[PDB]
Design a binder for this molecule. Structure first.
Ligand SMILES: CC(C)(COP(=O)(O)O)[C@@H](O)C(=O)NCCC(=O)NCCS
Ligand SMILES: CC(C)(COP(=O)(O)O)[C@@H](O)C(=O)NCCC(=O)NCCS
Ligand SMILES: CC(C)(COP(=O)(O)O)[C@@H](O)C(=O)NCCC(=O)NCCS
Ligand SMILES: CC(C)(COP(=O)(O)O)[C@@H](O)C(=O)NCCC(=O)NCCS
Ligand SMILES: CC(C)(COP(=O)(O)O)[C@@H](O)C(=O)NCCC(=O)NCCS
Ligand SMILES: CC(C)(COP(=O)(O)O)[C@@H](O)C(=O)NCCC(=O)NCCS
Ligand code: NI
Ligand code: NI
Ligand code: NI
Lengths: 158, 158, 158, 158, 158, 158
């Protein structure tokens, strides 16, 4: 009877584009799980613990959302939660053809459905990679990231 | 804790691509409403009552799905159902940029979220318009349409 | 040393997406001409004089912008102004491949350059056609259109 | 060991973009058939006999190419020629997603393969529709159309 | 008199999407050559010998196809075969703009034509990279790869 | 009163596609600055000094253009020139969604406008990366690059 969606990603760091999508999922599904899946072949900026903390600290307003680590196939994580749905955001710059390819693959291997939702226009041009690039060069992306992330970026400059 | 999505469209006629999406919505939301909205400036093949019957007859396996007519804004229909979500299918040939434009407009005017889902590959190249075109020229699209639709299409050539 | 761009379109009616682009052109070129060209085979809502008035009334803050009518090729209009550049806006739902085709054709036939600019995100999902559709069905698009347009749109439902 | 492709379209009128593709097909297949199929619900400029003549007159340098009319499904035309392949050109402004949809539909209903080829850059921005539009407004598209077409287009303005 | 196409790629490993395209090329050209071109700057999973063996073992049903190694420009390989045509598959996730760029480049430098064909829907979401990723994480992509490839992936787990 | 645009890039090496765009910018803005911004995380082929020299040597026909190095955010460079406009070219293979994302980001952080222009068809399929790849394998891309670049590539073979 209880519905549910997983919002998977690398979240290095989580942005307000991601939070917008978490909010939509939390509004439309009984339970939401944010799954952090780190790429074993891309050294990111933030370690796993920091990524988890940034998501948790940025989602306290969503009572029906929790945050977990995923270690293998996203579909294995989804099924482990007793769920069969993934929610993914679309923004300016999304590789949509690759998202579609992954969605079809995920449906084939595990029967998991993927629902795509367009990010709010004001948060439609932030991405983790571009936010880091701009921030590291001294640009102000603070309006595009949650305050828990802004705090950690400010300390990353030190 | 009750969740819900509306699957809106003109469904002239409903295809197995549409049914695939109804199935995904019905699996992931507590209730689904198929909303038939007609373009008052379009040369529809089937009248509204035939469209309703085809959708109903093609969805008897989905116990939490109902079929209704809308006469104005899709967002007004969605809210009249006590819902705030739309589910739309993607296929080969979808005008995705227009779908994105409508999704953003619908969110702006009424706060309604739109979730997009990729149709199953076998049903990814049928559309109402192309099915009608092929059928009228004697082609066999019966594997891409529900039997309630095939029946009526066959009676149109009789 | 005098520079200039033409912003052509049907503007039926002008939107805040269009005004955003007029503003960018006016900031970057010495003179801007808004060129209203009407599709002689299109069911326009507003007559040419109403379209001109709406553009003029919506651009009083741009001192280097003027509004004129064109009756043939956009390139012939551009050259009649003593200019060789067109500025076109991009939004969610733009048929960009057609815009690219026209740009290449316009360069071929008359040497006229086309510059494309992305509309501000808040105005990225309004279009003349969708604004009219929503307004006629009772939806509120007033935040996406200039007040001179809202006034006339309200008088059309009166 | 005999190979063959059909190049279908409305060719109203044939352009140098189309001729470029005919040339590639003729270089790569033993026989090529240009198939003229008319949209019975389209306001074509040139009648079917004029379209045939323009194609024939523009392809005299291709000895393994013939021109024929089709009246129903393109796949039925292709099979009537003893062939199982279609060659379609891509240009700036092509509705590629619709082309992909038709290709998949054509393969489904008749087993016919579709091969897409990018038009030469110099001919990549002409289309029948845009050429007619520009020509009717007095623009010079003569470098983008075969001389047999230019002749007839000039006689239409006479 | 004999027609021919080259199907180039890295094939690390060959998938059923690739085989589908080989089948189309073999049906429409007198001879087909699969050319394996290894990227000297991307350590793949399978060495050149294994890639060749997987393609050969997966194409025994295509009597007019052979498999060869290419060492430099794909167009140099194509011309060395006495051919002037390349056939490339399209799938969900194809970087089509890059494929188009390469096609135009290949035509410019060597006069070689590229024909694109859409993969069968059931094989439209497999790619070499995604199949490896899923397989390495214990997912079942065996329905998307030829048995000669499945055998080698099973041994890669050991 | 003086208008201006910056044409930023990595230019490793500059191509005739880039020069085409420099020419358009120089025709439409009082002053143009080509800004070379080297990626600190991608070893290119040519060092910064060589990149600058190739651009300068290839633009002597543009009296109102100068060439400079940028060291951080492109928007910081643009504002340092007393300008607020960037001009970027589009070609076959452009990652347009990423260009749009950067344009929206650049507008957000610094109020800088980006104008996109389509490259001339004959120069629409060259890119720095593809030109290097083809040249290094002995292909002739000399018609797609300025002679100052061709000279340095010939010496790179030695
Ligand atoms: C984590 C992610 C969703 C990518 O997320 P990101 O775009 O936020 O980096 C994707 O890499 C993923 O699902 N990884 C787990 C591995 C997997 O399941 N691969 C199969 C994809 S079909
Ligand atoms: C019915 C439909 C979803 C289109 O469906 P279709 O693609 O199945 O024909 C769309 O035309 C619609 O929403 N119509 C109702 C009017 C409306 O709400 N218009 C504003 C859209 S932003
Ligand atoms: C007016 C417009 C720019 C379209 O504008 P719109 O998209 O705002 O309706 C276009 O239809 C146009 O240029 N019309 C004039 C005729 C012409 O020049 N046609 C040839 C175009 S390559
Ligand atoms: C003729 C054409 C190829 C379109 O050609 P055009 O783009 O040159 O106008 C297409 O309309 C067609 O195939 N018509 C015949 C009817 C048909 O087969 N329809 C089904 C297509 S999947
Ligand atoms: C091998 C391939 C076709 C890529 O194939 P892939 O997409 O299967 O990896 C491409 O990298 C290639 O053609 N390489 C040979 C080098 C070359 O010719 N480069 C020039 C391209 S225009
Ligand atoms: C230099 C370039 C324009 C890329 O140019 P290229 O596409 O020619 O390599 C881009 O990497 C850039 O702007 N770099 C400076 C760093 C920056 O400003 N990043 C923020 C982008 S929003
Ligand atoms: Ni519930
Ligand atoms: Ni000036
Ligand atoms: Ni033969």
């Amino acid at each position: 009877h209880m519905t549910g969606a997983v919002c998977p990603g690398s979240f290095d760091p989580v942005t307000l584009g991601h939070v917008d999508i978490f909010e939509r999922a939390a509004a439309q599904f009984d339970e939401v799980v944010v799954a952090i899946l780190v790429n074993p072949a891309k050294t990111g900026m933030f370690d796993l613990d920091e990524r988890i903390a940034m998501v948790k600290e940025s989602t306290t307003h969503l009572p029906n959302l929790r945050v977990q680590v995923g270690h293998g196939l996203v579909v294995d994580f989804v099924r482990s939660c007793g769920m069969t749905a993934i929610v993914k955001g679309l923004r300016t710059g999304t590789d949509f053809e690759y998202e579609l390819q992954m969605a079809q693959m995920n449906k084939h291997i595990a029967g998991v459905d993927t629902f795509f939702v367009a990010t709010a226009p004001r948060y439609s041009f932030v991405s983790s990679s571009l936010a880091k690039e701009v921030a590291m060069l001294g640009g102000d992306v603070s309006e595009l990231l949650p305050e828990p992330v802004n705090r950690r970026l400010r300390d990353r400059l030190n």
